[PDB]
Subunit: 461 residues, 3 copies
């Protein structure tokens, strides 16, 4: 079933190699695009496809965390002198071992004195004492990772085809890997070692995930990286993720719970007689009602194809680019001849909608029909075909044979509200063949839990 | 009044287009600079000017905020048992409705017990009770915006001029827009559709505003974006902007005021008899005496021409680059001929000063007189002309006709303290024409409010 | 002892300069790599070496800070009414002047009432009073600096050599400086002013230190910049560096100590009779046992050669790149001839190990023996020579004469655990000369202080 990719139309620059005090070469220069192919014959058709663009972020920090289910049970003591409900019993301490109660649960005590005598005597100033309880919700487990400045790699696919009696035959097929952060990188591509591929980047990739805190879910086991305010290992913000952390054993606890609990737990007596109180947690990312989970970066970020922790060693994360800038190629050899070939660009029809998504992304959700090669778009002013061009684009369909593909076209802010015409034309197609349609514009836009003790009072009068 | 821009001197690379199993083209390649023009004739003079470079950041978060005017009124109760000044009346509660008092005001209550008996009896431990009041200052309103990784666009200006009887005539004039983050983008430029402009970026722009929190003022209505420590929607740091937020109705409130007020308001009794107390707010960005407003990015950042929220929909912000890297151009056609033209570079005189600004920017505040084209500078070691060159620069004046322009020249750290010579020479000018001057070096460098209640005590003994 | 650098093998593109209504030039185009040289003769051998790549970050914020040695002495008062240990004496106040005690010490008082009567009477509720003391540890002093978006400069070395009777003679030798963030920069290189060097960057450097907070040690005096969670001037997080700040005089104090001390100091009575208590600081970066110092960026970050505050004025920091992308060069002249030369690439042997360091860096710690020029590596699948290639690299040794050098080779994540073969071959060397070795894989991975007062109680009953 062996078949070459669509050979793109690329201008070629003939450069001449410098010389030493010896025996007069030449280099063939061109700019290859990501997710496109280049074809040539040596005077067996040679093809190179810039398949993948990846960033390899080192993982500097790591820590497992979860989402806690919080429950607070209190008790009031009317007499400020009483032995029950005290600083030594409640202030900065975990409620001692119940022996039967769950191993997964994690509790912390807080001391609330200087109360108002409601359902009490006018002179005696009450005191409140609470057990803040935390257990994992739905057994949700995530790894938190600190991704720092990456190394960039390009992945090329070298294939050599032959036309033997009516059909194509993939003779040789390799994967070429080249580091893009330094100078030129050079290697032979064919088995015959006659030809050399030289890859050079202009500067940094058009895109790169920002150095920061990331995470993904764990299935008792890595998954698609997400981004939501998360705490660096050394930080403990209660409004950001990771204050409920998993230790070695698999036991979850509130990071410096003992000490911090009194700054994040706030309770006031409603009536000491009925044993009623107002309670809250001055935090986020807890259950109930304080936790929603952000979708993977892949989903929300069009430039991202995938963003995942590479393996079980948890040392690097790989960001696979969906959109990237071209790379500079030079093909060199002794002294022979090189000719570059290119298939034609075609298009039957297209469909799509202009959308501003919930994450503020302005794109044209384009779908091409029976298409191949380089396809040129022109976004128009009004609904009228022939109105003024406001943006001009070029999409590249990688299929040798005309097929139906779906793609995302980033648009400038000039492509504002209201429906408008868009005109697609393949490469070197007469303006009679140019398909036009009126495209639609869509746009997506962007506490106290009062309880009566329940457990009853053991110390009434 | 139709006139072409200064046609820059640019080397042109002749590349040959690849071929298919059909009918032997050619492509003209060159690197266009931002704020410069390129001229050519087809064998009507064709001109292309790289006019604008813009980043289009999606706005992920949004919230209106203000600056609060804070006022705290207190009262002391000598007897720790008293019904006046209590946890239920003061701890975690907004002072109930006054019915006459301002709608714009926002108040919060705090409870300060366990006091020292100053102007009281040696055994009874006092208690203090305060109403922290907040109202907008000068009706100042700002939108807070979260700018994330942008899409880059180039804006070109295509104009075709003709010389009809002594004067130039702008025949055709278009605006070309090309996305710079992906592969090559291609479109026709002339009405005749004979010529095609192909734009390719090397990698990311030399500059890009960092993903973070930004804001600008609102005039009851967007303005020039500023940068000052500001809170992300989900965060509530009191030392950073946006803790005083505007809801739907236009009412400003302290974000989670009720709960947090006791962590940020700190008061101690001075004398319970005279009703004197020491008061403070453990926050920033409040009035009086705790608020200065950072100038727009445009002002402080030389690389920024403008940074503004694009429109009323508040979905994207546009950063217009003042300084940027060159773009790769290729002009292609059937088979005809292309010749590139360039006007000469001139300079009468210059003036300027070497400055290190308050924001640590080392630049040469250059002013050119009766100048056009490419102008070459050479910064010298000492005040002596002919001393060793320490930096070499090239500025490009876009005016066809010699005019007076002012510009910013970024300098390395080697261009240290003390006055020195700088020598300017236009392109291809003999070293006799080279203007020299000794340039001057300038350098810019980088709580408790105690009150006696006033309202008097209603509860004396 | 004058000697040229290894002249690299570089393809040269012949471009033709545009023309005006006057007298037909030409430009020689090539991509120079960082830490490599280019050689040519004009028809005295001319050499240009891209020596240095630097980022010049402006320093927007500055503040000296230290590391504090913390000591807390307390005292308990059993009777809640007592004149000793009070809100006025302890809450939000510095312990008044001792007159003899150290000038370097900085103390703060905290008030802990509503205690439990341990070693006391069942009805009287105690109170605790502490003096938190802070002094510099080991007289450690550091400057905190805010580095913002930099300006990029390239530093070239132009040298012209002559071969006079058996040996080379360095005739002319200059340092060329070119700004990389804008358009093309142009200057003459030779004393004869015949030749012009034109430098153009594709986009941003492959690497750039992130805008943020940095610091380095001071020797009573700048040093190698480090990175560790540090507070921006306006922020006061106790879990991050710089809360212990040095004022003008050289006196260190806790940033807003008075006010914050009660939020970060937490103490509970153990027994009021014996005068025993549990004490802690809810902070980081303090002594004892809460401070380790991060190594310089140079050490941890392979892409960084050096990162240092430039000088005594403390206005800019210079980041010297160890790894960077190529720059675009064009050499132009009247009308004459240019020929480019290149020495050969050689290699005797090599040694090294594949390492994943503590900071998650995957690299090949390569050491070359009797080597010069362009050296090509091929990382193999298994230990077997001849197994499948998984990565391909190219290193450039700058020595004209074959010497022994050590280098860092960034590797993709595909180069996983276990030993494997790596094959090095110089440029244009037959596959017989290719040295192979099996290389080893190494991998580095990533509270309450209870005291009895000691000072004794002055107020027993
Ligand atoms: C795509 O382009 C290639 C390369 O130009 C074409 O390949 C030729 O295939 C035929 C049979 O169709 C042979 O007889 C030729 O010798 C091939 N050329 C070379 C240079 O090896 C190809 O057919 C085109 N395909 C489509 C689907 O448009
Ligand atoms: C700038 O350069 C242009 C293009 O080389 C010059 O344009 C010519 O204008 C004259 C009249 O002055 C005509 O007779 C020519 O045919 C034009 N050339 C082309 C190629 O169309 C121009 O005059 C120069 N201007 C300045 C102010 O220096
Ligand atoms: C490196 O390359 C240079 C340049 O090609 C060689 O330089 C020549 O030196 C010899 C003496 O050895 C002279 O007679 C030539 O005229 C030089 N050439 C030029 C163009 O000026 C050089 O010897 C080579 N060196 C090594 C160590 O390999
Ligand atoms: C998860 O809790 C579940 C129920 O939600 C239980 O089946 C299981 O033993 C727990 N284990 C882990 C490893 O999360
Ligand atoms: C986007 O494009 C694909 C392909 O046509 C389709 O599944 C989907 O409906 C589109 N979504 C929107 C919102 O246009
Ligand atoms: C493309 O979709 C259309 C129907 O909308 C049809 O012309 C065609 O069969 C589809 N698939 C391919 C591979 O051409
Ligand atoms: C602003 O307060 C002013 C006085 O500063 C008053 O004229 C006005 O009604 C207020 N309105 C808004 C919308 O800010
Ligand atoms: C900078 O340049 C302009 C133009 O000459 C002028 O308005 C201004 O005085 C200059 N400022 C300084 C500080 O040199
Ligand atoms: C430039 O300024 C000078 C005076 O400093 C003068 O030569 C000239 O008239 C000015 N303007 C133009 C457009 O040349
Ligand atoms: C540093 O403390 C030392 C001992 O560690 C003492 O010799 C000296 O006077 C102090 N001075 C400064 C400037 O740090
Ligand atoms: C890295 O390379 C150098 C040079 O051979 C050597 O000093 C050192 O042992 C190496 N370290 C490791 C861990 O391989
Ligand atoms: C390189 O090291 C080896 C020994 O490991 C030896 O061949 C040689 O003398 C050394 N130095 C140079 C400059 O060649």
């Amino acid at each position: 079933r062996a078949e070459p990719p669509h050979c793109s139309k690329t201008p070629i620059v003939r450069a001449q190699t410098s010389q030493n005090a010896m025996s007069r070469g030449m280099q063939m220069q061109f700019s290859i695009g990501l997710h496109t192919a280049v074809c040539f014959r040596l005077y067996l058709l040679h093809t190179i496809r810039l398949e993948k663009l990846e960033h390899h972020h080192p993982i500097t920090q790591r820590y497992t965390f979860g989402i806690p289910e919080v429950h607070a049970s209190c008790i009031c003591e009317c007499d400020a002198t009483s032995s029950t409900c005290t600083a030594e019993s409640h202030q900065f301490t975990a409620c001692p071992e119940s022996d039967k109660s769950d191993e997964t649960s994690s509790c912390y005590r807080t001391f609330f004195p200087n109360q108002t005598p409601i359902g009490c005597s006018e002179d005696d100033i009450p005191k409140l004492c609470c057990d803040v309880r935390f257990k994992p919700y739905k057994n949700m487990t995530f790894l938190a990772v600190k991704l720092e400045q990456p190394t960039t790699y390009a992945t090329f696919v070298y294939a050599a085809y032959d036309f033997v009696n009516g059909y194509w035959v993939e003779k040789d097929k390799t994967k070429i890997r080249s580091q893009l952060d330094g100078g030129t990188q050079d290697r032979h591509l064919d088995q015959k070692r006659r030809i050399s591929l030289a890859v050079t980047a202009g500067g940094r990739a058009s895109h790169q995930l920002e150095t920061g805190m990331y995470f993904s879910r764990t299935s008792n086991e890595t998954e698609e990286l997400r981004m939501q305010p998360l705490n660096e290992i050394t930080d403990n913000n209660f409004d950001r993720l990771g204050w409920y952390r998993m230790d070695d054993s698999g036991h979850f606890h509130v990071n410096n719970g003992v000490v911090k609990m009194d700054d994040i737990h706030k309770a006031k007596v409603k009536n000491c007689k009925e044993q009623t109180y107002k309670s809250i947690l001055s935090a986020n990312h807890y259950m109930p009602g304080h936790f929603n989970l952000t979708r993977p970066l892949e989903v929300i970020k069009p430039w991202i194809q995938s963003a995942r922790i590479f393996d079980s060693s948890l040392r690097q994360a790989v960001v696979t680019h969906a959109e990237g800038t071209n790379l500079q190629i030079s093909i060199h050899l002794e002294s022979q001849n090189l000719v570059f070939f290119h298939n034609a660009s075609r298009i039957r029809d297209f469909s799509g909608s202009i959308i501003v998504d919930s994450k503020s992304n302005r794109l044209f959700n384009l779908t091409v029909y029976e298409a191949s090669g380089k396809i040129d778009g022109s976004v128009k002013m009004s609904t009228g075909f022939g109105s003024d061009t406001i943006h001009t684009f070029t999409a590249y369909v990688s299929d040798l044979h005309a097929s139906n593909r779906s793609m995302i076209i980033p648009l400038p802010a000039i492509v504002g509200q209201g429906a408008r015409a868009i005109c697609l034309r393949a490469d070197s197609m007469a303006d009679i063949d140019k398909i036009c349609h009126v495209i639609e514009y869509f746009e997506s836009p962007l506490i106290k839990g009062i309880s009566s003790i329940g457990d009853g009072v053991m110390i009434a009068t």
